[PDB]
Design a protein around this ligand. Structure first.
Ligand SMILES: [Cl-]
Ligand SMILES: [Mg+2]
Length: 271
């Protein structure tokens, strides 16, 4: 066996309590693993705007600290947010997916490196949620007035769960082949370029750093975490994970409410 050198950790439902804080147990386990030289990388659907305050809270400011944001469409240096890898959707892909959302009956919003956009005039509660909780500015703009050179890192279909699940059932299987289409919560569907996901993001960084899959632990809760939990040598699901994520995990740890991230770090790293 090999020791763990990198821990990839999802944020919502996994690192963070429901009030969006990091418990003292989880902050102390992450500090103990980084004091030993183990690299810890927050690996999330969120935009960077929703990550950089937590990087500073976790003292992820050293030259060898990274984060993976926008569901793997962006890999960054944590000290200053600079880009290490990017793959964006095109403008034609934005217009196709914006129209698809109106056919299948879901609200929709798009993100670039700094801003959250929607063409919905009745703005979903879950677009206000993303703007407020991920601390990212919100701009209303009609689809046909969007700048065609916007750099579309990810888009999302967001809605009440019953509306979003009805919408998912109406998406043709071809679209699910053409793009990365994965839920991150009952009310969020993440959509990005098919070349990128959290698994590709973790593998990109592991190859930059000379770290084998065997030396990686990944921790998550929802459908958009399955590929990184399968790629890692130690794939971990919190107890509040959906069933399909527990199925592919090596280990099911405690819920986020009971500090499952700290318990996993103690099991595979600190002990
Ligand atoms: Cl996520
Ligand atoms: Mg999550």
């Amino acid at each position: 066996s090999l020791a763990i050198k990198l821990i990839a950790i999802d944020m919502d439902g996994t690192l963070l309590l429901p009030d969006h804080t990091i418990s003292p147990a989880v902050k102390n386990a992450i500090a103990a693993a980084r004091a030993r030289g183990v690299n810890v990388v927050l690996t999330t659907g969120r935009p960077y705007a929703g990550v950089h305050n937590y990087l500073k809270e976790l003292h992820m400011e050293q030259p060898g600290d990274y984060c993976i944001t926008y569901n793997g469409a962006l890999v960054q240096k944590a000290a200053d947010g600079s880009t290490v890898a990017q793959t964006a959707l095109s403008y034609d892909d934005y217009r196709f997916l914006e129209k698809l959302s109106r056919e299948v009956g879901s609200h929709f919003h798009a993100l670039d490196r700094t801003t959250l956009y929607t063409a919905n005039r009745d703005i979903s509660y879950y677009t206000v949620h993303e703007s407020f909780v991920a601390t990212i500015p919100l701009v209303f703009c009609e689809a046909e007035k969007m700048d065609p050179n916007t750099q579309f890192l990810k888009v999302m279909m967001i809605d009440e769960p019953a509306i979003l699940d009805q919408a998912i059932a109406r998406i043709p299987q071809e679209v699910k082949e053409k793009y990365t289409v994965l839920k991150s919560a009952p009310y969020f569907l993440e959509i990005l370029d098919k070349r990128v996901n959290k698994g590709t993001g973790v593998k990109s960084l592991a190859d930059v750093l000379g770290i084998k899959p065997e030396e990686i632990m990944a921790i998550g809760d929802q459908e958009n975490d399955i590929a990184m939990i399968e790629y890692a040598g130690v794939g971990v699901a919190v107890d509040n994970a959906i069933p399909s994520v527990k199925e592919v995990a090596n280990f099911v740890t405690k819920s986020n409410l009971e500090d499952g991230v700290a318990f996993a770090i103690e099991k595979y790293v600190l002990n």
